[PDB]
Subunit: 139 residues, 2 copies
Protein backbone atom coordinates (compact mmCIF):
# COMPACT_ATOMS: atom_id res chain seq x y z
CA UNK A 1 0.00 0.00 0.00
CA UNK A 2 1.68 3.15 -1.34
CA UNK A 3 -0.59 6.15 -0.67
CA UNK A 4 0.35 7.90 -3.90
CA UNK A 5 -2.54 7.31 -6.32
CA UNK A 6 -4.85 5.56 -3.78
CA UNK A 7 -8.51 6.42 -3.11
CA UNK A 8 -7.33 7.09 0.44
CA UNK A 9 -5.09 9.87 -0.91
CA UNK A 10 -8.06 11.54 -2.62
CA UNK A 11 -10.10 11.18 0.59
CA UNK A 12 -7.38 12.83 2.69
CA UNK A 13 -7.34 15.72 0.24
CA UNK A 14 -11.10 15.94 0.33
CA UNK A 15 -11.28 15.73 4.13
CA UNK A 16 -8.42 18.25 4.41
CA UNK A 17 -10.39 20.70 2.24
CA UNK A 18 -13.58 20.12 4.31
CA UNK A 19 -12.00 20.54 7.75
CA UNK A 20 -10.14 23.61 6.47
CA UNK A 21 -13.43 25.14 5.42
CA UNK A 22 -15.08 24.02 8.68
CA UNK A 23 -12.54 26.01 10.67
CA UNK A 24 -13.07 29.13 8.53
CA UNK A 25 -16.86 28.76 8.61
CA UNK A 26 -16.94 28.30 12.39
CA UNK A 27 -14.75 31.37 12.92
CA UNK A 28 -17.12 33.31 10.65
CA UNK A 29 -20.09 31.99 12.67
CA UNK A 30 -18.19 32.98 15.84
CA UNK A 31 -18.05 36.62 14.69
CA UNK A 32 -21.77 36.62 13.96
CA UNK A 33 -22.43 35.32 17.46
CA UNK A 34 -20.07 37.97 18.81
CA UNK A 35 -22.11 40.86 17.41
CA UNK A 36 -25.41 39.24 18.45
CA UNK A 37 -24.16 38.97 22.03
CA UNK A 38 -24.21 35.16 21.89
CA UNK A 39 -20.94 34.74 23.73
CA UNK A 40 -21.40 31.09 24.78
CA UNK A 41 -22.16 30.19 21.14
CA UNK A 42 -19.18 32.25 19.92
CA UNK A 43 -16.92 30.38 22.38
CA UNK A 44 -18.29 27.01 21.26
CA UNK A 45 -17.66 27.87 17.60
CA UNK A 46 -14.04 28.84 18.44
CA UNK A 47 -13.52 25.67 20.47
CA UNK A 48 -14.94 23.44 17.77
CA UNK A 49 -12.75 25.33 15.28
CA UNK A 50 -9.65 24.26 17.23
CA UNK A 51 -10.92 20.71 16.83
CA UNK A 52 -11.03 21.17 13.05
CA UNK A 53 -7.46 22.54 13.16
CA UNK A 54 -6.30 19.26 14.74
CA UNK A 55 -8.26 17.26 12.09
CA UNK A 56 -7.00 19.31 9.13
CA UNK A 57 -3.37 19.18 10.33
CA UNK A 58 -3.67 15.43 10.99
CA UNK A 59 -4.82 14.90 7.40
CA UNK A 60 -2.00 17.10 6.15
CA UNK A 61 0.63 15.09 8.03
CA UNK A 62 -0.41 11.95 6.14
CA UNK A 63 -0.23 13.93 2.87
CA UNK A 64 3.43 14.76 3.59
CA UNK A 65 4.02 11.35 1.96
CA UNK A 66 2.56 12.35 -1.40
CA UNK A 67 2.74 16.15 -1.66
CA UNK A 68 1.03 19.45 -0.86
CA UNK A 69 -2.71 19.18 -1.73
CA UNK A 70 -2.61 22.70 -3.18
CA UNK A 71 0.33 22.11 -5.54
CA UNK A 72 1.36 18.42 -5.50
CA UNK A 73 4.87 19.56 -4.48
CA UNK A 74 6.99 18.11 -1.61
CA UNK A 75 6.58 19.77 1.78
CA UNK A 76 8.18 19.41 5.19
CA UNK A 77 11.20 21.70 5.46
CA UNK A 78 10.80 25.48 5.41
CA UNK A 79 12.61 25.50 2.04
CA UNK A 80 10.08 23.13 0.55
CA UNK A 81 7.18 24.86 2.26
CA UNK A 82 8.18 28.27 0.91
CA UNK A 83 8.73 26.74 -2.52
CA UNK A 84 5.23 25.21 -2.51
CA UNK A 85 3.67 28.41 -1.17
CA UNK A 86 5.28 30.44 -4.00
CA UNK A 87 4.03 27.99 -6.65
CA UNK A 88 0.50 28.02 -5.28
CA UNK A 89 0.39 31.81 -4.92
CA UNK A 90 1.87 32.21 -8.43
CA UNK A 91 -0.97 30.11 -9.81
CA UNK A 92 -3.50 32.24 -7.92
CA UNK A 93 -2.27 35.64 -9.18
CA UNK A 94 -1.40 34.63 -12.78
CA UNK A 95 -4.34 32.27 -13.48
CA UNK A 96 -7.04 31.65 -10.87
CA UNK A 97 -8.07 35.09 -9.61
CA UNK A 98 -7.76 37.00 -12.97
CA UNK A 99 -9.77 34.19 -14.55
CA UNK A 100 -12.43 34.54 -11.85
CA UNK A 101 -12.46 38.32 -12.25
CA UNK A 102 -13.17 38.04 -15.97
CA UNK A 103 -15.98 35.52 -15.52
CA UNK A 104 -17.56 37.72 -12.82
CA UNK A 105 -17.35 40.85 -14.99
CA UNK A 106 -18.77 38.88 -17.95
CA UNK A 107 -21.78 37.84 -15.79
CA UNK A 108 -22.43 41.37 -14.54
CA UNK A 109 -20.99 40.90 -11.01
CA UNK A 110 -18.86 44.03 -11.06
CA UNK A 111 -18.21 44.33 -7.30
CA UNK A 112 -17.18 40.65 -7.04
CA UNK A 113 -14.95 41.05 -10.11
CA UNK A 114 -13.14 43.94 -8.39
CA UNK A 115 -12.83 41.76 -5.28
CA UNK A 116 -11.16 38.98 -7.27
CA UNK A 117 -8.81 41.61 -8.71
CA UNK A 118 -8.02 42.95 -5.26
CA UNK A 119 -7.09 39.39 -4.26
CA UNK A 120 -5.04 38.71 -7.42
CA UNK A 121 -2.94 41.71 -6.39
CA UNK A 122 -2.70 40.52 -2.77
CA UNK A 123 -1.63 37.03 -3.84
CA UNK A 124 1.08 38.59 -6.05
CA UNK A 125 2.23 40.50 -2.98
CA UNK A 126 2.21 37.22 -1.00
CA UNK A 127 4.22 35.30 -3.66
CA UNK A 128 6.81 38.08 -3.85
CA UNK A 129 7.09 38.33 -0.06
CA UNK A 130 7.64 34.56 0.24
CA UNK A 131 10.18 34.70 -2.65
CA UNK A 132 12.15 37.33 -0.69
CA UNK A 133 12.02 35.16 2.45
CA UNK A 134 13.16 32.11 0.43
CA UNK A 135 16.11 34.09 -0.98
CA UNK A 136 17.13 34.94 2.61
CA UNK A 137 16.61 31.42 4.01
CA UNK A 138 19.71 30.02 5.72
CA UNK A 139 19.13 26.33 6.40
Amino acid sequence: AQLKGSKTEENLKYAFAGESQANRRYLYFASKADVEGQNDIAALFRSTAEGETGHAHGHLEYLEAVGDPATGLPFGTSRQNLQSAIAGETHEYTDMYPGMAKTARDEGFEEIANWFETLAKAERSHANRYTKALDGLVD
Copy 2:
Protein backbone atom coordinates in the same frame (compact mmCIF):
# COMPACT_ATOMS: atom_id res chain seq x y z
CA ALA B 1 -27.83 39.25 -12.17
CA GLN B 2 -28.86 36.35 -9.94
CA LEU B 3 -25.71 35.05 -8.16
CA LYS B 4 -27.35 31.66 -7.56
CA GLY B 5 -26.60 29.24 -10.39
CA SER B 6 -23.85 31.44 -11.89
CA LYS B 7 -20.29 30.44 -12.66
CA THR B 8 -19.26 33.24 -10.26
CA GLU B 9 -21.02 31.32 -7.46
CA GLU B 10 -18.90 28.27 -8.26
CA ASN B 11 -15.74 30.39 -8.36
CA LEU B 12 -16.54 31.88 -4.95
CA LYS B 13 -17.04 28.38 -3.54
CA TYR B 14 -13.78 27.17 -5.09
CA ALA B 15 -11.83 30.24 -3.91
CA PHE B 16 -13.33 29.89 -0.43
CA ALA B 17 -12.10 26.29 -0.29
CA GLY B 18 -8.63 27.30 -1.57
CA GLU B 19 -8.17 30.21 0.86
CA SER B 20 -9.46 28.02 3.72
CA GLN B 21 -6.78 25.41 2.91
CA ALA B 22 -4.08 28.06 2.44
CA ASN B 23 -4.57 29.29 6.00
CA ARG B 24 -4.33 25.71 7.32
CA ARG B 25 -1.25 24.97 5.15
CA TYR B 26 0.48 28.18 6.23
CA LEU B 27 -0.13 27.49 9.95
CA TYR B 28 1.25 23.98 9.46
CA PHE B 29 4.31 25.43 7.69
CA ALA B 30 4.69 27.93 10.59
CA SER B 31 4.86 24.99 13.02
CA LYS B 32 7.57 23.34 10.96
CA ALA B 33 9.57 26.59 10.95
CA ASP B 34 9.01 26.95 14.73
CA VAL B 35 10.68 23.61 15.34
CA GLU B 36 13.55 24.30 12.93
CA GLY B 37 14.26 27.66 14.57
CA GLN B 38 13.22 29.68 11.52
CA ASN B 39 11.31 32.22 13.55
CA ASP B 40 11.23 34.99 10.92
CA ILE B 41 9.77 32.54 8.39
CA ALA B 42 7.27 31.22 10.96
CA ALA B 43 6.13 34.79 11.69
CA LEU B 44 5.68 35.38 7.96
CA PHE B 45 3.58 32.25 7.38
CA ARG B 46 1.42 33.33 10.35
CA SER B 47 0.99 36.88 8.98
CA THR B 48 0.17 35.62 5.48
CA ALA B 49 -2.35 33.20 7.06
CA GLU B 50 -4.15 36.23 8.52
CA GLY B 51 -4.45 37.52 4.96
CA GLU B 52 -6.03 34.24 3.88
CA THR B 53 -8.59 34.55 6.71
CA GLY B 54 -9.62 37.95 5.37
CA HIS B 55 -9.89 36.55 1.83
CA ALA B 56 -11.87 33.44 2.84
CA HIS B 57 -14.21 35.47 5.05
CA GLY B 58 -14.70 37.96 2.21
CA HIS B 59 -15.73 35.08 -0.08
CA LEU B 60 -18.09 33.67 2.55
CA GLU B 61 -19.78 37.04 2.92
CA TYR B 62 -20.76 37.05 -0.78
CA LEU B 63 -22.00 33.45 -0.41
CA GLU B 64 -24.47 34.49 2.31
CA ALA B 65 -26.62 35.37 -0.73
CA VAL B 66 -26.78 31.75 -1.86
CA GLY B 67 -26.12 29.58 1.21
CA ASP B 68 -23.44 27.74 3.15
CA PRO B 69 -21.00 25.94 0.81
CA ALA B 70 -21.03 22.90 3.08
CA THR B 71 -24.80 22.45 3.33
CA GLY B 72 -26.74 24.66 0.88
CA LEU B 73 -28.57 26.09 3.91
CA PRO B 74 -28.90 29.86 4.53
CA PHE B 75 -26.52 31.31 7.14
CA GLY B 76 -25.98 34.58 9.00
CA THR B 77 -27.81 34.29 12.34
CA SER B 78 -26.52 32.07 15.13
CA ARG B 79 -29.68 30.01 14.77
CA GLN B 80 -29.00 29.45 11.07
CA ASN B 81 -25.25 28.98 11.66
CA LEU B 82 -25.71 26.24 14.27
CA GLN B 83 -28.28 24.49 12.07
CA SER B 84 -25.87 24.44 9.12
CA ALA B 85 -22.94 23.32 11.28
CA ILE B 86 -25.12 20.53 12.65
CA ALA B 87 -26.20 19.33 9.17
CA GLY B 88 -22.66 19.32 7.88
CA GLU B 89 -21.28 17.50 10.94
CA THR B 90 -24.13 14.96 10.75
CA HIS B 91 -23.13 14.08 7.20
CA GLU B 92 -19.42 13.84 8.17
CA TYR B 93 -19.97 11.42 11.08
CA THR B 94 -22.75 9.24 9.63
CA ASP B 95 -21.50 9.04 6.02
CA MET B 96 -18.25 10.72 4.98
CA TYR B 97 -15.72 9.59 7.59
CA PRO B 98 -17.13 6.01 8.00
CA GLY B 99 -16.96 5.64 4.21
CA MET B 100 -13.33 6.85 4.17
CA ALA B 101 -12.35 4.53 7.04
CA LYS B 102 -13.68 1.55 5.12
CA THR B 103 -11.96 2.56 1.86
CA ALA B 104 -8.75 3.01 3.83
CA ARG B 105 -9.01 -0.42 5.46
CA ASP B 106 -9.78 -1.99 2.06
CA GLU B 107 -6.68 -0.45 0.44
CA GLY B 108 -4.43 -1.58 3.30
CA PHE B 109 -4.09 1.68 5.31
CA GLU B 110 -5.02 0.53 8.80
CA GLU B 111 -3.64 3.54 10.72
CA ILE B 112 -5.36 6.03 8.45
CA ALA B 113 -8.57 3.98 8.73
CA ASN B 114 -8.39 4.23 12.51
CA TRP B 115 -7.71 7.96 12.08
CA PHE B 116 -10.87 8.38 10.03
CA GLU B 117 -12.84 6.45 12.67
CA THR B 118 -11.43 8.69 15.39
CA LEU B 119 -12.74 11.70 13.43
CA ALA B 120 -16.11 10.02 12.87
CA LYS B 121 -16.49 9.81 16.63
CA ALA B 122 -15.25 13.43 16.97
CA GLU B 123 -17.71 14.84 14.44
CA ARG B 124 -20.51 12.98 16.24
CA SER B 125 -19.46 14.69 19.41
CA HIS B 126 -19.28 18.05 17.63
CA ALA B 127 -22.73 17.53 16.08
CA ASN B 128 -24.31 16.60 19.45
CA ARG B 129 -22.60 19.51 21.22
CA TYR B 130 -23.89 21.98 18.63
CA THR B 131 -27.42 20.52 18.85
CA LYS B 132 -27.27 21.18 22.60
CA ALA B 133 -26.25 24.80 22.07
CA LEU B 134 -29.02 25.13 19.49
CA ASP B 135 -31.67 23.94 21.96
CA GLY B 136 -30.28 26.37 24.58
CA LEU B 137 -30.19 29.34 22.17
CA VAL B 138 -32.31 32.31 23.19
CA ASP B 139 -32.78 34.81 20.37
